Amino acid sequence: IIGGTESKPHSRPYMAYLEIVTSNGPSKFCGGFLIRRNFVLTAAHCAGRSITVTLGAHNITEEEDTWQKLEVIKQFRHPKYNTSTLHHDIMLLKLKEKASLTLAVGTLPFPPGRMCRVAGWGRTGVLKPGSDTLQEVKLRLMDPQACSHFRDFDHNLQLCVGNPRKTKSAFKGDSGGPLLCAGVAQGIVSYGRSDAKPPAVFTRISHYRPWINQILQAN
Ligand SMILES: CS(=O)(=O)NCc1c(C(=O)O)n(Cc2cccc3ccccc23)c2ccc(F)cc12
Numbered sequence: 742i743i744g745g746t747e748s749k750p751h752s753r754p755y756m757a758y759l760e761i762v763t764s765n766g767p768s769k770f771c772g773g774f775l776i777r778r779n780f781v782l783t784a785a786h787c788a789g790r791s792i793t794v795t796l797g798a799h800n801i802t803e804e805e806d807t808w809q810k811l812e813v814i815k816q817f818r819h820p821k822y823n824t825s826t827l828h829h830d831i832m833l834l835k836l837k838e839k840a841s842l843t844l845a846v847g848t849l850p851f852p853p854g855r856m857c858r859v860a861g862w863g864r865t866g867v868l869k870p871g872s873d874t875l876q877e878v879k880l881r882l883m884d885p886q887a888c889s890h891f892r893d894f895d896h897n898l899q900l901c902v903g904n905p906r907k908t909k910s911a912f913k914g915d916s917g918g919p920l921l922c923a924g925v926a927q928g929i930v931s932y933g934r935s936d937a938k939p940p941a942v943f944t945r946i947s948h949y950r951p952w953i954n955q956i957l958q959a960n
């Protein structure tokens with residue numbers, strides 16, 4: 742998160758930190774969010790061989806009594822996910838078991854106004870480290886025209902997020918995190934410019950509600 746603030750600890754109790762063993766070799770990290778006791782929503786590009794989800798966290802180097810760490814048993818990557826265009830960058834994760842609902846661990850409920858918020862443990866600048874602590878930032882939902890420079894941008898599938906006159910943005914490390922507008926999840930962090938210039942591109946959750954509901958009904 743660029744230009745944001747450290748979240749109040751445990752104030753976003755749906756947030757999930759994902760550790761992904763790369764089908765090749767080492768680990769990578771993404772965000773995600775708990776939508777049911779045993780389901781997490783994240784980006785398709787975060788997929789890998791095996792996934793661990795950490796719930797209840799604030800500082801990821803600091804185990805607390807709030808933590809619940811759960812193995813993913815099934816990855817449901819969107820079938821039309823396209824590595825080239827990055828369309829349908831969405832993925833459901835089934836947890837080996839149900840999370841205990843606590844103050845620090847909770848599910849996120851399912852058109853938006855302009856001001857939204859996003860959280861994550863990603864980089865705090867172009868060449869900065871990832872954040873040990875959960876950061877958050879308020880961002881403006883932009884007209885699709887503001888993202889016309891992204892060749893594969895499709896208003897039906899995606900949100901255009903972040904006023905270009907400011908540095909405030911999701912960035913690398915924030916993939917899979919939810920965009921909330923008025924307490925409702927509208928978006929999922931997907932991609933943007935490598936120079937961190939807003940806006941960035943988020944998956945439009947509403948378009949995928951049939952598919953989500955389908956997987957939840959069958960699992
Ligand atoms: C660890 S991972 O599983 O996420 N893989 C690396 C990766 C990232 C990342 O580091 O998060 N992002 C997001 C991202 C990238 C570059 C610029 C961005 C500007 C804004 C927001 C997000 C941005 C990807 C998008 C498409 C993709 F195929 C791979 C990646």
Ligand SMILES: [Zn+2]
Pocket residue numbers: 750751799805807
């Ligand atoms: Zn704490």
